[PDB]
Amino acid sequence: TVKSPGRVNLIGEHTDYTYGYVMPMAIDLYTIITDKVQLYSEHFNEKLDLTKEGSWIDYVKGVLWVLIQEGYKIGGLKKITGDLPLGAGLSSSASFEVGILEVLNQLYNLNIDPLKKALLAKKAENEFVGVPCGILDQFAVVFGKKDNVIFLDTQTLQYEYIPFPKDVSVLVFYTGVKRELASSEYAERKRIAEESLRILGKESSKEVTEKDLGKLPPLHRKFFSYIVRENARVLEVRDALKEGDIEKVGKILTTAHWDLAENYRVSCEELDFFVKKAMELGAYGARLTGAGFGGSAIALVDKDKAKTIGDAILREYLAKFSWKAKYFVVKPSDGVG
Ligand SMILES: Nc1ncnc2c1ncn2[C@@H]1O[C@H](COP(=O)(O)OP(=O)(O)O)[C@@H](O)[C@H]1O
Ligand SMILES: OC[C@H]1O[C@H](O)[C@H](O)[C@@H](O)[C@H]1O
Ligand SMILES: [Mg+2]
């Protein structure tokens, strides 16, 4: 049996597709996997000689395809339970991918080293399932460590563990919203960023200057100016956190949210409602997490106060919107084990 965590991004959003900085954490809500390929998906109540079908099994088929293309000698396997909500923005995708991968890693004794576990799970999701996405999710879910977040330079895969204060909790709030446009909006942001680097002669958003941004056209400059600003915030969250100044960390997430919401235009009414309400109830800061357009948000909150805050925002939110929102008081966790 294998426990694969989900994940949350502390700071550094829409940054990995230009090879900038990122600071995920694995969280303590999991996927749990228990001759041919025949699996029971407990959530769905349901299913080597490798076609896409249009169903969830496609994540399973993409990992075996990716191990085989790489030459590993594996076989089949014969149940999936879990805490983790699907489609919430807590990357059940990556949890499931690398949970499957590590079952094979353990059984068929592949002794695959961690960073390849992540790069392998991400190729399965990019090439097999049709879904674009940097290394954020797979890395977090594999490299998570107990009382830590992971600073990652995604250009160079150079990472650093930074203790997250034990008397501070990350409040995860799932809005219940998954907008249908989210997918093509992600790809547009991504298309536009790729183009910007290309116009500028640059290879990463770490390199980009004030005079560089002046050379981009209106929308490209609006979108890329945000990324250059996040990169800087990540570095500032990095120092703040290593001094245990969680109030500075919190102020920075807050700035980040409104830069995301106004400029990169990937927030929505209900993420903003959560952030606004978190701040009326004493949070250090709060901010959407993941792609945007719905999904989940985080608030930094004292541990002793977290359930009272969450319950307050939940009821406040459920009076305003009809979606099935949930929240979780979450602990930074170990990656796949
Ligand atoms: N426990 C699971 N059992 C079966 N399928 C799963 C499981 N976890 C994730 N999945 C599959 O992965 C998808 C997760 O979707 P995704 O678009 O990446 O949203 P999220 O960001 O939460 O991962 C689900 O739709 C489902 O097809
Ligand atoms: O930072 C936002 C985030 O959006 C999605 O979650 C992708 O899977 C990530 O790679 C990253 O781009
Ligand atoms: Mg996902």
From Swiss-Prot:
Pathway: Carbohydrate metabolism; galactose metabolism. Substrate binds at E13, H14, T15, D16, Y186. This is Galactokinase. Disulfide bonds: none annotated. Monomer. The lineage of its organism: Archaea, Methanobacteriati, Methanobacteriota, Thermococci, Thermococcales. Its EC number is 2.7.1.6. It is an enzyme of class 2 (transferase). One of its GO terms (molecular function) is ATP binding. Transmembrane segments: none annotated. The gene is galK. It comes from Pyrococcus furiosus (strain ATCC 43587 / DSM 3638 / JCM 8422 / Vc1). Its main location: cytoplasm.
